[PDB]
Amino acid sequence: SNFKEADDAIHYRQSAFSLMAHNFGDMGAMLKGKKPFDSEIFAMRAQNVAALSKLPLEGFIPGSDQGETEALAKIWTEKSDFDAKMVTLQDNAAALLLASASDDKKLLKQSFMQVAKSCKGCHDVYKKD
Amino acid sequence: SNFKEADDAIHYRQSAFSLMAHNFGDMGAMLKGKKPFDSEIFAMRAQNVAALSKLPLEGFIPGSDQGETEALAKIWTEKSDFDAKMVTLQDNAAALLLASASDDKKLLKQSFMQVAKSCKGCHDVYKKD
Numbered sequence: 191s192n193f194k195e196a197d198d199a200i201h202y203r204q205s206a207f208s209l210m211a212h213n214f215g216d217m218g219a220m221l222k223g224k225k226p227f228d229s230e231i232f233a234m235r236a237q238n239v240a241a242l243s244k245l246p247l248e249g250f251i252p253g254s255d256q257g258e259t260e261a262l263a264k265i266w267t268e269k270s271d272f273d274a275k276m277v278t279l280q281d282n283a284a285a286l287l288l289a290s291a292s293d294d295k296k297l298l299k300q301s302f303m304q305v306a307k308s309c310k311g312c313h314d315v316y317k318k319d
Numbered sequence: 320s321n322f323k324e325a326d327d328a329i330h331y332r333q334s335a336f337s338l339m340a341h342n343f344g345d346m347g348a349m350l351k352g353k354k355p356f357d358s359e360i361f362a363m364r365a366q367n368v369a370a371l372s373k374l375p376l377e378g379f380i381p382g383s384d385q386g387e388t389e390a391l392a393k394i395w396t397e398k399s400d401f402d403a404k405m406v407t408l409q410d411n412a413a414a415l416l417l418a419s420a421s422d423d424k425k426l427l428k429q430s431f432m433q434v435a436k437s438c439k440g441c442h443d444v445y446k447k448d
């Protein structure tokens with residue numbers, strides 16, 4: 191068992207998502223002009239998102255749908271699809287990290303959008319309203 | 320500013336340390352025989368620790384020594400020493416990541432020990448008792 195209690199796995203996955211969101215949202219703000227675009231900071235943010243996208247899945251242990259969590263129970267009865275959506279987030283995030291090595295803003299925006307689709311798509315199905 | 324409020328910066332750096340501890344402790348348990356050693360998991364842990372070690376510094380914004388934190392105000396009056404300690408944690412994490420590419424248990428333990436000193440060394444000076 192990777193966690194002592196269900197409440198440690200919830201906090202772990204919640205912390206992971208939160209930190210990913212902080213780094214993802216900064217890339218969104220730079221791409222929308224809410225804050226100046228910076229190639230080096232954007233690349234750091236993309237690296238952080240790629241790495242942090244590999245953390246939360248470990249936290250979705252059996253029985254951790256009870257408690258102070260927004261995870262829906264259907265996650266575990268459809269864990270194969272949930273797992274697939276998490277792998278595709280990782281893949282998309284690795285692609286955004288690659289796009290940050292290029293100077294093509296089309297590419298950055300496109301791979302960013304694909305990653306944003308992954309956050310959104312999973313929340314729509316597997317996160318409480 | 321990267322954070323709207325000081326409390327968001329505290330929560331960010333605390334989450335990063337929290338995820339780091341979970342990953343660092345799993346490596347400790349494997350190196351101490353508290354749980355089966357797994358080279359593939361161990362390497363993932365080492366990768367996770369190195370990536371996570373690059374995150375918390377951003378959360379140490381000025382004025383965030385007040386709030387729901389265990390950080391000492393001293394961090395800000397000795398910020399370059401604190402920063403140097405964070406970089407050395409990154410250095411040691413990178414060496415632990417490299418060591419994880421080998422099967423030399425002694426080198427694994429030494430590398431793990433070197434990271435452990437960094438955690439403890441900084442806590443001893445800059446985290447409340």
Ligand code: HEC
Pocket residue numbers: 200203204205207208210211214239258259260261262272273275276279305306308309310312313316317
């Ligand atoms: C399923 C395959 C997901 C992917 C892809 C993404 N997220 Fe998500 N997120 C998911 C769940 C099931 C939960 C609830 C966790 C819980 O135990 O309550 C979340 C939660 C978040 C949160 C809130 C975390 C918190 O502080 O409580 C955030 C900010 C968040 N998720 C962001 C986020 C982003 C930015 C993503 C794309 C980079 C993303 N998630 C993908 C499920 C899934």
Ligand code: HEC
Pocket residue numbers: 329332333334336337339340343368387388389390391401402404405408434435437438439441442445446
């Ligand atoms: C200084 C350069 C540090 C290094 C190196 C490490 N840690 Fe630390 N940690 C530091 C501070 C100043 C704080 C308090 C932050 C706050 O605002 O309260 C912490 C906190 C932690 C915690 C508690 C996190 C929480 O849930 O509130 C943990 C579990 C932790 N740190 C673990 C940890 C590990 C495993 C480290 C080595 C890999 C490590 N820290 C290094 C300062 C510094």
